Design a protein around this ligand. Structure first.
Ligand code: GDP
Ligand code: GDP
Lengths: 420, 81, 420
């Protein structure tokens, strides 16, 4: 079934704008939305088919008090995305309240696309955590979607924000988002601003314009995570089959990301596989262990190398994991596209369930716990107090995320057979 | 020298007895006089008798076979005894 | 097993910086650690393997009151050594105390590499004796390593300092270092600033910039001492296998150096051996005798003549020794590398246990004994007095080094069978 992407918030709208542009050039598409003449791939899932080959992405763009939003509209690709479905604070509470009054028109825009498609399998959100308007509005829309569309499976390309710690309420906003995400997301793929900023400092000298350049890094991961779905394959063609292996227990649905070519701008599989297990290529910042690992390689890979390669990574043990889940690394292979350059034709990515990401969740919980005692930034803005007089959703969120922090470490232990 | 039986059927033993000694030392880091001493000294004497016997045999006159003696004859340790 | 080199102190960090650079060009490695396109060697021991051919050596760089650690960072080879493991007085006591507070983080940096490697066989320290910060910190780290790795062995490329005798406490600092080095070091390779300075005056006119030029001399010896391990061969295919012959009694573990073409910038084996035994080729400054001698040759060497060379060197008797040890000299061979110049097509080095080095130890013990009576430089700095109020470790060191001075001369005697 076709996938509908609910890109929301200024930050989320920036990475959806680029992700669709990335699949414009990668696929046989043009800024008008029509196919290029020069142009064997499965464009049905991601791109709606118009009568005159105007393959329009099924993007849902949500904006709130737009000013810099108009920049997406003044672009050569404005015609490419024309489902004609765009509808008009820095606080999590401020975003949640604004979403509630406009919920029905934004929800009808969801319906239109659902009716238009032959079918709808999942809602992929370009979510921004502690995103000012992006968070709060995104949590609320996350709660409505599961109730209305229980059958579908949701994913979140959460850009978890770590900038070395401006938002003084950033921990409070993030704390609330996770309680909803844990509760109302079937899957989440985690990314980190600092981890990518550190990569940007590593591969390039770019430091001050970190957000503009890092957009390309988030994009390469995003296009890559779905390339097996976008291009024809003998296995995991459906999104669901892919999702099951990466998330073995429902609560632990957060996925770590890595790219074998930190710089993609021959190499045998035995090599490309080993790079994913080096921490310099990872993009995320008591014993600790992965729960299950998966990898997808691109290009005309030599296959015999993989049997040697898979048995080879095994002797290397570069990846240390002994979870409750069996955790064999899974090997996938896909075709690099026939439009984009063949430089570094072989290039890989890995998506894995790792207990280390628990540490990133605890750090915002640490900032929040410190901030909660001080009550330095309760906002006490009338919106914040009137929306939350008890201020007990933050405590409800704190116990739910602490259960998550606890569950992760329970995964490390030998007995996750018992309740976690 | 594998072709000639005597040098071969005596050097092999120089290695095999050494394996047994290597095993006795391998057994414990604590000092071992539990019959180890009885054989360890029999071994020191046993290894000197054979080690000198082949020293005497060593001393086609191949440069390699005769020249090898002089590494041991730097101290003349076995001959002096 | 892979060797981890704990280069410490400004002087020690200077000779590790160069030694790794020397093996950069000698091996197939560029300044970014990338496999060279132009490029048969065992690089596993000295160089860790990153997936994209980043040959990053397992160097542990320790900085204290840093100045030359910042210059190491602004170099083209900064990328080559990136285990990302560098962590922030002229007195031996001043260095030992500073090391104790930071011992656990520097020790975790040791652990990381030990865990990362398939295995760890030895810790090779680019130690500086009476090195201000380098000594004291180096003695303390020498004591911790043996306790944590009781099975493992520690070597020391001690640059014993002789500059014609500025440090007014130099003898006191050196006295303390040896006591630790005599009981807590499995092997030590001795070098001398004056001996090399005399060589520098001999081969070249360089006198005033003695430290910069002599770095190359220490390096040629250092690269050379390991070439049998770094390149595969019939015998001495592991460090420990080689170490045993050079050190016959545990206390006497100090090794002298020499190089046949000091001016390496055809020659038969019979010649390169005789040249080495002569004392100009030596780099170190009652009957006296060597305990054991060993030699390694890397060049266009004929095989049928090497045994005949040992016989020919036996007839010359240029090397006089009648020690308790039964170890006779042996003719070893190693592989000269391609790419770098093949000048002095045949070129050699010798590592030997010689009782003459006892004299260098006694000279610092002589300066110290003279200095101890005067008490001219007790420092009495509160660090020095508070750390050592009794000042009895210096006396403990004096008896231990005197036992060593005595043991050496006992080696010269006919009865080292009796206790030495
Ligand atoms: N990855 C990425 N993150 C961004 C970018 N711009 C902003 N952000 C993130 O967006 C978050 C704040 O959202 P914000 O821009 O305030 O949303 P707004 O309230 O709509 O302005 C911060 O946590 C930033 O890390 C970008 O270009 N790339
Ligand atoms: N071989 C060699 N020794 C050096 C060099 N530079 C300094 N030293 C030695 O280092 C010792 C003093 O260490 P020092 O440089 O004071 O360490 P600091 O306290 O960090 O400055 C002296 O004994 C010198 O012989 C060098 O370039 N080569």
């Amino acid at each position: 079934r076709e996938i509908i992407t609910l890109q929301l918030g200024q930050c989320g709208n920036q990475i959806g704008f680029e992700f669709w542009k990335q699949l414009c050039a990668e696929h046989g598409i043009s800024p008008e939305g029509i196919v290029e003449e020069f142009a064997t791939d499965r464009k049905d899932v991601f791109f709606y088919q118009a009568d005159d080959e105007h393959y329009i992405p099924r993007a849902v763009l949500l904006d709130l008090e737009p000013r810099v939003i108009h920049s997406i509209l003044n672009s050569p690709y404005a015609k490419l995305y024309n489902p004609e479905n765009i509808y008009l604070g820095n606080n999590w509470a401020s975003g949640f309240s604004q979403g509630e009054k406009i919920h029905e028109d934004i929800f009808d825009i969801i319906d239109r696309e659902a009716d238009g498609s032959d079918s709808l399998e999942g809602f992929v959100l370009c979510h921004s955590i502690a995103g000012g308007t992006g968070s709060g509005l995104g949590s609320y829309l996350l709660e409505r979607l599961n109730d209305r569309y229980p059958k579908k499976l949701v994913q979140t390309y959460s850009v978890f924000p770590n900038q070395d710690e401006d938002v003084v309420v950033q921990p409070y906003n993030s704390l609330l988002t996770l309680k909803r995400l844990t509760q109302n997301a079937d899957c989440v793929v985690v990314l980190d601003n600092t981890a990518l900023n550190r990569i940007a400092t590593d591969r390039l000298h770019i430091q001050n314009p970190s957000f503009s350049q890092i957009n390309q890094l988030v994009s390469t991961i995003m296009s890559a995570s779905t390339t097996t779905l976008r291009y024809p394959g003998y296995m995991n063609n459906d999104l669901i089959g892919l999702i099951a292996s990466l998330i073995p227990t429902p609560r632990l649905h957060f996925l770590m990301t890595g790219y074998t070519p930190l710089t993609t701008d021959k190499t045998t599989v035995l090599d490309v596989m080993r790079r994913l297990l080096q921490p310099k290529n990872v993009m995320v910042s008591t014993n600790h262990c992965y729960i299950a690992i998966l990898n997808i390689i691109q290009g005309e890979v030599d296959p015999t190398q993989v049997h040697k390669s898979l048995q080879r990574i095994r002797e290397r043990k570069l990846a240390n994991f002994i979870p409750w889940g069996p955790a064999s690394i899974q090997v996938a292979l896909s075709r690099k596209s026939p439009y984009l350059p063949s430089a570094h034709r072989v290039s890989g990515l890995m998506m894995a369930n790792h207990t280390s990401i628990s540490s990133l969740f605890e750090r915002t919980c640490r900032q929040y716990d410190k901030l909660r005692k001080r009550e330095a930034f309760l906002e006490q803005f009338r919106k914040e107090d009137m929306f939350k007089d008890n201020f007990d959703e933050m405590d409800t969120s704190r116990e739910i995320v602490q259960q998550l922090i606890d569950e992760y470490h329970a995964a490390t232990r030998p007995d996750y057979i018992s309740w976690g | 020298f594998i072709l000639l039986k005597p040098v071969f059927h005596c050097l092999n033993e120089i290695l095999d007895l050494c394996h047994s000694f290597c095993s006795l030392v391998s057994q414990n880091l604590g000092p071992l006089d539990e019959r180890g001493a009885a054989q360890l000294s029999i071994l020191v004497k046993g290894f000197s008798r054979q080690s000198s016997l082949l020293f005497k045999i060593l001393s086609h006159q191949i440069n390699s076979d005769l020249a090898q003696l002089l590494l041991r004859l730097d101290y003349n340790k076995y001959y002096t005894q």
